[PDB]
Amino acid sequence: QLQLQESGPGLVKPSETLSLTCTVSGGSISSSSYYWGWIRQPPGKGLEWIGSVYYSGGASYNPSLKSRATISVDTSKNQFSLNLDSVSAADTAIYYCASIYGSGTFYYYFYMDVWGKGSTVTVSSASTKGPSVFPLAPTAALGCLVKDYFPEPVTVSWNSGALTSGVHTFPAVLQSSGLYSLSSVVTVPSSSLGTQTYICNVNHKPSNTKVDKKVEPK
Amino acid sequence: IQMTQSPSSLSASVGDRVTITCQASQVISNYLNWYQQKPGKAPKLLIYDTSNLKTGVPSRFSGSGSGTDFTFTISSLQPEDIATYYCQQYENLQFTFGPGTKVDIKRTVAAPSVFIFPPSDEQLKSGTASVVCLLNNFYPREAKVQWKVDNALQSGNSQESVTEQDSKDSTYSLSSTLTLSKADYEKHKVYACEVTHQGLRSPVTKSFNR
């Protein structure tokens, strides 16, 4: 099974350049029936196709971004990368790399077979800041407060992924300080409060921070 | 030229047959595909070549169309089919996605479970205090939360965040965080958040002291 994984910086300063790399796994990038492309999704907007390349090197871009975007492929490393020059604030989006399957007798008929996970790219001159995790001590509810981090995103797990039911990870909110604040809670029965232990696995990739906070009552 | 997708938003109860339309910029010349993008995750195609569906996609999804007009139909809606649906078109060496159709589920009016959390001792030691008011699984999305410090309304120093509709019980969840300095937090004792919801006959308020 094909599986694509993005690997970008997450934060790029204005007027600088953005570089993301998409590594294909479970299958060779040097296949006749596949094109490899990039699609970005701005906050609260639709999907915008940036470009696409063939394993030989045949590039193809969207007219608006053709002046900036340059997508290259690396057969020896089994990956393809996007380079968007002169990045601006309007390019803050979630960049998805996708696998475009093509089959055809006369010309290829395309549909984007497999998609990537997505990279939250934020175009800002502000510096990176790691988060601070605080417990929300307590059917009773308990959670964690991930305050003062930049940029997005933050992924919060519970009990190393074992606890999943009834977990609500709220969307981040930008404070007046320019930093984001996130909250993730879970509703568990009151009887299990004393017996079972609860930990939230907060992870902030842009700052390379992984915090395992233990939430206890009182 | 112009690629449209109607309707923009949608709200239909579980079990309803809902159809969506897509209008390509030109007459179809390559495969038309349909993608399902749940909130947060990446798009996943369900239907390719207007009619065919990918292996593993449930039988309830279907599609048809010809020329410049196309349709996307689901026979029996289920709670995890809530997503923004896009239609893909490949013309003139360009992959163009439709505006998208946000579909929501109509649910029976549910009452929120209100929880109030005091600021942790670690945060108070740093010099700031944040008190959170949690609203668990309430329909519809419209709800009003007001902070009252010592039975006095507060404004400006609190911001809220609502989750996307659930995939199991189809309910929203809210979280408002009131932030004050450690000096201002020591000046008062009672902190409460009033929850005003249409599925709540009395404005439920939860408080604490110290």
Short mmCIF file of C-alpha atoms in Angstrom, two decimals:
data_model
loop_
_atom_site.label_atom_id
_atom_site.label_comp_id
_atom_site.label_asym_id
_atom_site.label_seq_id
_atom_site.Cartn_x
_atom_site.Cartn_y
_atom_site.Cartn_z
CA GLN A 1 0.00 0.00 0.00
CA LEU A 2 1.22 3.49 -0.89
CA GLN A 3 1.87 5.96 1.94
CA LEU A 4 3.11 9.53 1.52
CA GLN A 5 4.63 11.55 4.37
CA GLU A 6 5.44 15.26 4.29
CA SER A 7 8.48 16.78 6.01
CA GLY A 8 8.58 20.56 6.04
CA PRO A 9 9.82 23.36 8.29
CA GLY A 10 6.39 24.46 9.56
CA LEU A 11 7.38 28.13 9.84
CA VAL A 12 8.93 30.26 7.08
CA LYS A 13 9.68 33.97 7.35
CA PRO A 14 8.12 36.42 4.86
CA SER A 15 9.82 37.01 1.49
CA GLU A 16 11.82 33.84 2.22
CA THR A 17 11.36 30.43 0.58
CA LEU A 18 9.28 27.40 1.57
CA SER A 19 10.62 23.88 1.05
CA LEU A 20 8.68 20.68 1.75
CA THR A 21 9.63 17.09 0.96
CA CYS A 22 7.20 14.20 0.44
CA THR A 23 8.63 10.70 0.90
CA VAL A 24 6.75 7.82 -0.74
CA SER A 25 6.72 4.49 1.11
CA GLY A 26 5.42 1.07 0.16
CA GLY A 27 6.10 1.68 -3.53
CA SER A 28 8.64 3.20 -5.89
CA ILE A 29 8.32 6.79 -7.07
CA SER A 30 9.70 5.63 -10.44
CA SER A 31 6.45 4.15 -11.73
CA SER A 32 4.92 4.62 -15.17
CA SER A 33 1.33 4.99 -13.94
CA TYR A 34 1.80 7.77 -11.36
CA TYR A 35 2.24 11.53 -11.20
CA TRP A 36 3.26 13.20 -7.94
CA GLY A 37 1.71 16.55 -7.05
CA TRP A 38 1.22 19.16 -4.34
CA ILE A 39 -2.08 20.68 -3.16
CA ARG A 40 -2.42 23.40 -0.53
CA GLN A 41 -5.45 24.35 1.57
CA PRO A 42 -5.54 27.84 3.15
CA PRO A 43 -7.37 28.28 6.48
CA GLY A 44 -11.08 27.94 5.85
CA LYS A 45 -10.69 27.74 2.06
CA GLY A 46 -10.85 25.03 -0.59
CA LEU A 47 -8.14 22.99 -2.25
CA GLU A 48 -5.64 24.62 -4.62
CA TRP A 49 -3.49 22.40 -6.84
CA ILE A 50 0.07 23.75 -6.91
CA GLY A 51 1.74 21.43 -9.39
CA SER A 52 2.72 17.90 -10.32
CA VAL A 53 5.79 16.08 -11.63
CA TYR A 54 6.58 12.78 -13.32
CA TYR A 55 9.40 10.51 -12.15
CA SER A 56 11.46 11.44 -15.22
CA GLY A 57 11.25 15.14 -14.35
CA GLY A 58 8.27 16.44 -16.31
CA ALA A 59 7.06 19.44 -14.32
CA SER A 60 3.59 21.00 -14.45
CA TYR A 61 2.28 23.92 -12.41
CA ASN A 62 -0.76 26.12 -11.78
CA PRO A 63 -0.56 29.39 -13.76
CA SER A 64 -0.73 31.57 -10.65
CA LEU A 65 2.04 29.69 -8.81
CA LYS A 66 4.10 28.73 -11.87
CA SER A 67 6.12 31.93 -11.39
CA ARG A 68 7.28 30.72 -7.94
CA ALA A 69 6.72 27.00 -7.41
CA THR A 70 9.36 24.52 -8.58
CA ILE A 71 8.74 20.82 -7.85
CA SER A 72 11.63 18.37 -8.21
CA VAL A 73 11.86 14.60 -7.82
CA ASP A 74 14.61 12.46 -6.29
CA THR A 75 14.59 8.86 -7.53
CA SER A 76 17.59 7.78 -5.45
CA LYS A 77 15.85 8.94 -2.26
CA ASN A 78 12.30 8.00 -3.36
CA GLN A 79 10.76 11.40 -2.67
CA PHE A 80 9.64 14.62 -4.35
CA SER A 81 9.97 18.16 -3.03
CA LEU A 82 8.25 21.52 -3.51
CA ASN A 83 9.99 24.91 -3.49
CA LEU A 84 7.75 28.00 -3.35
CA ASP A 85 9.87 31.13 -3.75
CA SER A 86 9.08 34.58 -2.32
CA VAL A 87 6.56 33.24 0.17
CA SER A 88 4.00 35.71 1.49
CA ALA A 89 1.42 35.77 4.27
CA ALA A 90 -1.25 34.61 1.81
CA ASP A 91 0.63 31.30 1.36
CA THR A 92 -0.07 30.16 4.93
CA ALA A 93 -1.87 26.87 4.28
CA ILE A 94 -1.86 23.11 4.86
CA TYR A 95 0.23 21.58 2.08
CA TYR A 96 -0.84 18.08 1.01
CA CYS A 97 1.27 15.89 -1.26
CA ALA A 98 -0.76 13.38 -3.25
CA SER A 99 -0.26 10.39 -5.53
CA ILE A 100 -1.99 10.90 -8.89
CA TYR A 101 -2.73 7.63 -10.68
CA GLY A 102 -2.79 7.73 -14.46
CA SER A 103 -3.95 5.12 -16.97
CA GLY A 104 -4.94 5.60 -20.58
CA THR A 105 -4.88 4.24 -24.12
CA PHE A 106 -4.86 7.64 -25.85
CA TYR A 107 -4.08 9.93 -22.90
CA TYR A 108 -3.87 9.24 -19.18
CA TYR A 109 -7.01 9.53 -17.04
CA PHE A 110 -6.09 10.89 -13.60
CA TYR A 111 -7.42 10.55 -10.07
CA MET A 112 -5.46 11.26 -6.89
CA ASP A 113 -5.10 7.74 -5.44
CA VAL A 114 -3.25 8.33 -2.15
CA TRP A 115 -2.87 11.54 -0.14
CA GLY A 116 -0.41 12.68 2.50
CA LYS A 117 -0.97 13.78 6.07
CA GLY A 118 -0.50 17.52 5.55
CA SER A 119 2.00 20.11 6.77
CA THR A 120 0.72 23.21 8.57
CA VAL A 121 2.96 25.93 7.11
CA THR A 122 2.77 29.35 8.78
CA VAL A 123 4.38 32.34 7.05
CA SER A 124 5.45 34.69 9.85
CA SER A 125 8.51 36.63 10.97
CA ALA A 126 7.81 35.71 14.60
CA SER A 127 10.07 33.20 16.32
CA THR A 128 9.18 29.71 17.52
CA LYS A 129 7.94 29.16 21.07
CA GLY A 130 7.33 25.83 22.77
CA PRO A 131 4.22 25.15 24.85
CA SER A 132 3.50 24.87 28.56
CA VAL A 133 1.17 22.09 29.71
CA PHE A 134 -1.05 22.51 32.78
CA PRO A 135 -3.47 19.92 34.22
CA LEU A 136 -7.23 20.41 34.42
CA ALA A 137 -7.82 18.42 37.59
CA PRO A 138 -11.36 17.01 38.14
CA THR A 139 -18.95 11.01 35.11
CA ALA A 140 -16.22 13.59 35.74
CA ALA A 141 -14.13 15.54 33.23
CA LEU A 142 -10.38 16.19 33.17
CA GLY A 143 -7.95 17.58 30.65
CA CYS A 144 -4.79 19.48 29.80
CA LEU A 145 -4.12 23.13 28.94
CA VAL A 146 -1.49 23.73 26.25
CA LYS A 147 -0.86 27.46 26.66
CA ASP A 148 1.46 29.88 24.83
CA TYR A 149 2.88 28.10 21.80
CA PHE A 150 3.78 29.20 18.28
CA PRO A 151 3.27 28.21 15.60
CA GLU A 152 0.52 25.66 14.95
CA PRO A 153 -0.12 22.75 15.27
CA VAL A 154 -0.14 20.68 18.48
CA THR A 155 -1.19 17.03 18.73
CA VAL A 156 -2.45 15.81 22.12
CA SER A 157 -2.83 12.09 22.80
CA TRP A 158 -4.20 10.39 25.91
CA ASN A 159 -2.67 7.37 27.68
CA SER A 160 -0.28 6.90 24.74
CA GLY A 161 -3.19 6.51 22.33
CA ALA A 162 -5.13 3.95 24.38
CA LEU A 163 -7.74 6.45 25.59
CA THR A 164 -9.78 7.58 22.58
CA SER A 165 -13.51 7.51 23.39
CA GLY A 166 -15.02 10.74 24.66
CA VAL A 167 -11.86 12.77 23.99
CA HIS A 168 -12.38 16.33 22.72
CA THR A 169 -9.34 18.29 21.51
CA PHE A 170 -10.48 21.88 21.04
CA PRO A 171 -9.18 24.00 18.15
CA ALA A 172 -6.41 26.42 19.02
CA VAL A 173 -7.16 30.09 19.66
CA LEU A 174 -4.74 32.96 19.06
CA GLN A 175 -4.32 35.12 22.16
CA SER A 176 -3.58 38.84 22.23
CA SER A 177 0.09 37.89 22.76
CA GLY A 178 0.23 36.34 19.29
CA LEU A 179 0.58 32.83 20.75
CA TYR A 180 -1.88 29.96 20.45
CA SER A 181 -3.65 28.20 23.31
CA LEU A 182 -5.15 24.71 23.10
CA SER A 183 -7.27 22.58 25.43
CA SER A 184 -7.94 18.84 25.32
CA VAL A 185 -10.36 17.16 27.75
CA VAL A 186 -11.83 13.69 28.24
CA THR A 187 -14.92 12.44 30.09
CA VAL A 188 -14.34 9.24 32.08
CA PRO A 189 -16.47 7.58 34.78
CA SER A 190 -15.98 8.86 38.31
CA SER A 191 -15.29 5.36 39.65
CA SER A 192 -12.09 4.98 37.60
CA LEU A 193 -10.64 8.25 38.96
CA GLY A 194 -8.72 6.60 41.80
CA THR A 195 -7.76 3.36 40.06
CA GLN A 196 -6.89 4.27 36.47
CA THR A 197 -4.11 6.76 35.73
CA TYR A 198 -4.45 9.44 33.05
CA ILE A 199 -1.71 11.21 31.08
CA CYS A 200 -1.93 13.51 28.06
CA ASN A 201 0.83 13.19 25.45
CA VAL A 202 1.27 16.75 24.17
CA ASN A 203 3.59 17.08 21.17
CA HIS A 204 4.69 20.30 19.44
CA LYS A 205 6.70 19.40 16.34
CA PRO A 206 7.65 22.98 15.25
CA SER A 207 9.58 23.39 18.52
CA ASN A 208 10.42 19.67 18.98
CA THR A 209 8.71 19.48 22.38
CA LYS A 210 7.07 16.37 23.86
CA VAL A 211 5.45 16.69 27.30
CA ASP A 212 3.74 13.88 29.24
CA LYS A 213 1.71 15.59 31.97
CA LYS A 214 0.05 13.49 34.68
CA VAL A 215 -3.45 14.70 35.59
CA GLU A 216 -4.42 13.91 39.19
CA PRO A 217 -7.42 14.98 41.29
CA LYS A 218 -7.31 17.60 44.06
CA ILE B 1 -13.98 29.90 -16.63
CA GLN B 2 -16.16 29.01 -13.65
CA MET B 3 -16.45 25.86 -11.49
CA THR B 4 -19.31 25.75 -9.00
CA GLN B 5 -20.60 23.32 -6.38
CA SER B 6 -24.05 23.55 -4.81
CA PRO B 7 -25.12 23.80 -2.14
CA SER B 8 -22.43 25.61 -0.14
CA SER B 9 -23.67 24.28 3.21
CA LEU B 10 -26.10 21.54 4.15
CA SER B 11 -27.83 20.13 7.23
CA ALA B 12 -29.79 16.87 7.08
CA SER B 13 -30.72 14.33 9.75
CA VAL B 14 -29.25 10.84 9.91
CA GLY B 15 -30.80 8.44 7.40
CA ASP B 16 -31.61 11.06 4.75
CA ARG B 17 -30.70 10.72 1.08
CA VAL B 18 -28.82 13.88 0.09
CA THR B 19 -27.56 14.72 -3.40
CA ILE B 20 -24.95 17.34 -4.32
CA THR B 21 -24.24 18.90 -7.71
CA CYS B 22 -20.99 19.91 -9.42
CA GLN B 23 -20.58 22.02 -12.57
CA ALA B 24 -17.30 21.73 -14.46
CA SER B 25 -15.73 24.69 -16.24
CA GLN B 26 -15.84 22.85 -19.59
CA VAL B 27 -17.32 19.70 -21.07
CA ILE B 28 -15.77 16.69 -19.35
CA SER B 29 -12.54 15.51 -20.99
CA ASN B 30 -10.84 13.55 -18.17
CA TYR B 31 -11.97 11.56 -15.14
CA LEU B 32 -14.21 13.42 -12.70
CA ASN B 33 -13.61 12.41 -9.09
CA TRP B 34 -15.23 13.09 -5.72
CA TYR B 35 -13.32 13.52 -2.46
CA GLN B 36 -14.37 13.37 1.20
CA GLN B 37 -12.38 15.52 3.64
CA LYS B 38 -13.36 15.15 7.29
CA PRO B 39 -12.38 18.10 9.52
CA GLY B 40 -8.65 18.03 10.16
CA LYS B 41 -7.70 15.03 8.03
CA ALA B 42 -6.70 14.84 4.36
CA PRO B 43 -9.09 14.31 1.43
CA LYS B 44 -10.02 10.77 0.41
CA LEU B 45 -11.60 9.99 -2.95
CA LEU B 46 -14.77 7.90 -2.94
CA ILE B 47 -15.96 8.07 -6.57
CA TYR B 48 -13.78 8.23 -9.69
CA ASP B 49 -14.83 8.56 -13.34
CA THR B 50 -18.19 10.08 -12.29
CA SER B 51 -19.67 6.65 -11.45
CA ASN B 52 -17.05 4.15 -10.27
CA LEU B 53 -16.17 3.93 -6.58
CA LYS B 54 -12.88 2.95 -4.97
CA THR B 55 -12.52 -0.45 -3.32
CA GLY B 56 -13.55 -0.22 0.33
CA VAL B 57 -15.89 2.76 -0.07
CA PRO B 58 -19.35 1.92 1.35
CA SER B 59 -22.13 1.01 -1.07
CA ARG B 60 -24.23 3.96 0.14
CA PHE B 61 -22.04 6.34 -1.89
CA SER B 62 -22.96 6.77 -5.55
CA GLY B 63 -22.51 9.25 -8.38
CA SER B 64 -23.70 10.01 -11.89
CA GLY B 65 -23.64 12.75 -14.49
CA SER B 66 -22.58 13.70 -18.00
CA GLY B 67 -21.45 16.69 -19.99
CA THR B 68 -21.03 19.71 -17.71
CA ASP B 69 -23.54 18.72 -14.98
CA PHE B 70 -22.79 16.05 -12.38
CA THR B 71 -24.28 14.71 -9.15
CA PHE B 72 -23.04 13.06 -5.96
CA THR B 73 -25.57 11.02 -3.99
CA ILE B 74 -25.47 9.04 -0.74
CA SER B 75 -28.33 6.61 -0.15
CA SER B 76 -28.48 6.52 3.67
CA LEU B 77 -26.55 9.12 5.66
CA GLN B 78 -24.59 7.97 8.72
CA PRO B 79 -22.87 9.98 11.46
CA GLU B 80 -19.32 9.59 10.13
CA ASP B 81 -20.22 10.90 6.66
CA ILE B 82 -19.96 14.50 7.94
CA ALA B 83 -17.28 16.20 5.84
CA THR B 84 -16.66 18.79 3.13
CA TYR B 85 -17.07 17.12 -0.27
CA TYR B 86 -15.12 18.31 -3.30
CA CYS B 87 -15.31 17.45 -7.00
CA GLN B 88 -12.14 17.26 -9.08
CA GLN B 89 -11.70 18.24 -12.72
CA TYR B 90 -8.61 17.93 -14.94
CA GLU B 91 -8.83 20.29 -17.93
CA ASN B 92 -6.15 22.25 -19.80
CA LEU B 93 -3.32 20.61 -17.81
CA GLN B 94 -4.87 21.92 -14.58
CA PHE B 95 -6.34 20.07 -11.61
CA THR B 96 -9.19 22.27 -10.37
CA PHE B 97 -11.19 21.50 -7.22
CA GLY B 98 -14.77 22.58 -6.65
CA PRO B 99 -15.78 25.05 -3.94
CA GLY B 100 -16.92 22.18 -1.73
CA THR B 101 -20.13 21.17 0.05
CA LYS B 102 -20.23 21.13 3.85
CA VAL B 103 -22.79 18.59 5.10
CA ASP B 104 -24.04 18.55 8.70
CA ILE B 105 -26.33 16.20 10.63
CA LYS B 106 -29.60 17.32 12.20
CA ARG B 107 -29.80 15.89 15.72
CA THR B 108 -32.25 15.98 18.61
CA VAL B 109 -31.63 18.99 20.86
CA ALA B 110 -29.15 17.89 23.53
CA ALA B 111 -28.19 19.57 26.85
CA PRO B 112 -24.55 20.48 27.57
CA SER B 113 -22.52 19.02 30.41
CA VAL B 114 -20.91 22.03 32.09
CA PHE B 115 -17.56 21.76 33.89
CA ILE B 116 -15.44 24.51 35.47
CA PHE B 117 -11.71 24.02 36.08
CA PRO B 118 -9.67 26.20 38.46
CA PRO B 119 -6.16 27.32 37.45
CA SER B 120 -3.37 24.92 38.34
CA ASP B 121 -0.78 25.73 40.99
CA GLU B 122 1.96 25.54 38.35
CA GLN B 123 0.37 28.29 36.25
CA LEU B 124 -0.27 30.50 39.29
CA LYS B 125 3.42 30.19 40.17
CA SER B 126 4.37 31.46 36.70
CA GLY B 127 2.33 34.63 37.20
CA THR B 128 -0.86 34.03 35.21
CA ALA B 129 -4.18 32.28 35.80
CA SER B 130 -6.55 30.69 33.29
CA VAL B 131 -9.92 29.24 34.32
CA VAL B 132 -11.70 27.03 31.78
CA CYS B 133 -15.44 26.42 31.37
CA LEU B 134 -16.24 23.24 29.44
CA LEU B 135 -19.49 22.50 27.56
CA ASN B 136 -19.65 18.82 26.60
CA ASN B 137 -21.73 17.47 23.70
CA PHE B 138 -24.48 20.03 23.03
CA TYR B 139 -26.72 20.58 20.00
CA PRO B 140 -27.15 22.91 18.24
CA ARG B 141 -23.84 24.78 17.94
CA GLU B 142 -25.38 28.05 19.17
CA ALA B 143 -24.67 28.60 22.87
CA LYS B 144 -23.87 31.59 25.06
CA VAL B 145 -21.33 31.59 27.91
CA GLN B 146 -20.82 34.49 30.33
CA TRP B 147 -18.16 34.81 33.02
CA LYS B 148 -19.14 36.28 36.40
CA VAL B 149 -16.37 37.06 38.90
CA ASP B 150 -17.90 37.74 42.34
CA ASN B 151 -21.33 38.02 40.67
CA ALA B 152 -20.00 40.64 38.25
CA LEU B 153 -19.92 40.24 34.48
CA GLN B 154 -16.55 40.08 32.71
CA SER B 155 -15.84 41.02 29.09
CA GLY B 156 -12.80 40.97 26.82
CA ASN B 157 -10.53 38.75 28.95
CA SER B 158 -12.07 35.47 27.73
CA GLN B 159 -12.11 33.65 24.39
CA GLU B 160 -13.93 30.44 23.46
CA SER B 161 -13.39 27.61 20.98
CA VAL B 162 -15.89 25.09 19.60
CA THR B 163 -15.10 21.65 18.19
CA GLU B 164 -16.36 20.31 14.89
CA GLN B 165 -19.43 18.08 14.95
CA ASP B 166 -18.75 14.64 16.37
CA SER B 167 -18.57 11.50 14.24
CA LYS B 168 -20.30 9.26 16.82
CA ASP B 169 -22.99 11.28 18.63
CA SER B 170 -22.96 14.28 16.24
CA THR B 171 -22.57 16.88 19.00
CA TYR B 172 -20.41 19.98 19.47
CA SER B 173 -18.23 20.90 22.44
CA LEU B 174 -17.22 24.34 23.70
CA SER B 175 -14.37 25.64 25.85
CA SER B 176 -14.08 29.24 27.07
CA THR B 177 -10.89 30.29 28.88
CA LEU B 178 -10.84 33.33 31.17
CA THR B 179 -7.31 34.63 31.74
CA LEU B 180 -6.26 37.03 34.51
CA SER B 181 -3.04 37.90 36.29
CA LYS B 182 -2.09 36.21 39.55
CA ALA B 183 -2.56 39.51 41.40
CA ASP B 184 -6.05 39.97 39.95
CA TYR B 185 -6.89 36.32 40.69
CA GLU B 186 -6.02 36.78 44.37
CA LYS B 187 -8.27 39.86 44.62
CA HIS B 188 -11.44 37.76 44.25
CA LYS B 189 -12.79 34.43 45.49
CA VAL B 190 -15.87 33.25 43.56
CA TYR B 191 -15.59 32.45 39.84
CA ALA B 192 -18.51 31.22 37.74
CA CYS B 193 -19.54 30.77 34.10
CA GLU B 194 -23.19 31.03 33.05
CA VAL B 195 -24.27 28.70 30.23
CA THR B 196 -27.32 29.79 28.20
CA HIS B 197 -28.49 27.14 25.73
CA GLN B 198 -31.72 26.62 23.80
CA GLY B 199 -31.87 23.02 25.05
CA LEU B 200 -31.47 24.26 28.62
CA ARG B 201 -34.62 25.40 30.43
CA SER B 202 -32.65 27.17 33.17
CA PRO B 203 -29.34 29.03 32.67
CA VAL B 204 -27.00 26.53 34.34
CA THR B 205 -24.06 28.13 36.18
CA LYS B 206 -21.12 26.36 37.83
CA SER B 207 -18.76 28.05 40.28
CA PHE B 208 -15.92 27.53 42.75
CA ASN B 209 -14.08 29.48 45.45
CA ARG B 210 -10.57 30.62 46.45
#
